[PDB]
Design a binder for this molecule. Sequence first.
Ligand SMILES: C[C@]12CCc3c(ccc4cc(OS(N)(=O)=O)ccc34)[C@H]1CC[C@@H]2OS(N)(=O)=O
Ligand SMILES: [Zn+2]
Length: 257
Amino acid sequence: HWGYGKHNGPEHWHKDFPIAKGERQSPVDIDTHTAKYDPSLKPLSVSYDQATSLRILNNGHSFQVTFDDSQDKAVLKGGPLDGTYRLLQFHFHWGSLDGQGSEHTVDKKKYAAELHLVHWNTKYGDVGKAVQQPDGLAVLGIFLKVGSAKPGLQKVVDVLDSIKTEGKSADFTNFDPRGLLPESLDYWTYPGSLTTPPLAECVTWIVLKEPISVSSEQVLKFRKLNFNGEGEPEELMVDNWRPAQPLKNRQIKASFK
Ligand SMILES: C[C@]12CCc3c(ccc4cc(OS(N)(=O)=O)ccc34)[C@H]1CC[C@@H]2OS(N)(=O)=O
Ligand SMILES: [Zn+2]
C-alpha cells in the first residue's frame, strides 16, 4: 500500500486513487502577491474550551490525537464556513531536516512541520458522510518553525515514546489544543482536498499566516517515530508530506491586507 517512500510515495498514489490528478487537490503553494484580500470574510471562531481529547495513535503515516465529537464541544465556525464544524483529530507532517516538512508553502518557502486540526460539518451527521461532500471538512493548518520551545506542545512530545511503531495507541486525556494556536488568526483559505489517500475533494482549507515556534528538541522527537510496526525493520517516520499540487482554476483568498 501507499506511503511516502520511493516506490509507494505521492507520485504513485494516482494509480490507486485517480482523483490524485483532480481539479482541487491539496496542498498548494500560497503566492502571497496573487492571493486576494476578501473583506467579506468573517473572523474565525474557535471554541475549544470544552474539548475532550481521548487517545493518541500512530497510524503508520503520522500520529494523531483524537477527540470526542459526539457533541458540539470543540467547534470551528465563522471565517469562510457556513455551519458548525466539530473537531475530530489533529496530526502533523514533518521533515527529515528543518528546511522541509510542511505541506503548504508560502511563496515557495517550506516550514519544518505543519499541524492540521481536522473538523467536519455537523449537518452531514457523521464524518463518513462529510467526506463525500464538497463542504464536508474544514482543516485548520498551522506552520511550525524551529526556534523557541512551545510549552503547550510538550505533553504531546513526552508521550511519543509510547507510540513509537505503527498501531500503538495510548490514553491521552485532558489535552487542551488551545496551547497550539498562534497569537493571530489571520488566514488564507481555498477549496481543496485531503492530502493523503483517499485524497477526497471535500476540504475547506484554512491556513494561518502566523507560524508557531517549536524547539529543535521538540521536533527531533517527531523524527524518532517509526513507519514500521514493532518487530519489523526500522524506518524512521520523516518526510510524511505531499508536495504542492497545481492550483488550476482556484483562487486563494486572504482575510487580511
Ligand atoms: C478514515 C477516513 C478517511 C481518511 C481521513 C478521515 C478524516 C480525516 C483525514 C485527514 C487526513 O489528512 S489531511 N492532511 O488533513 O488531509 C487524511 C485522511 C483523513 C476519515 C474520514 C472518514 C474516512 O473513513 S472511511 N473512508 O469512511 O472508512
Ligand atoms: Zn494533514
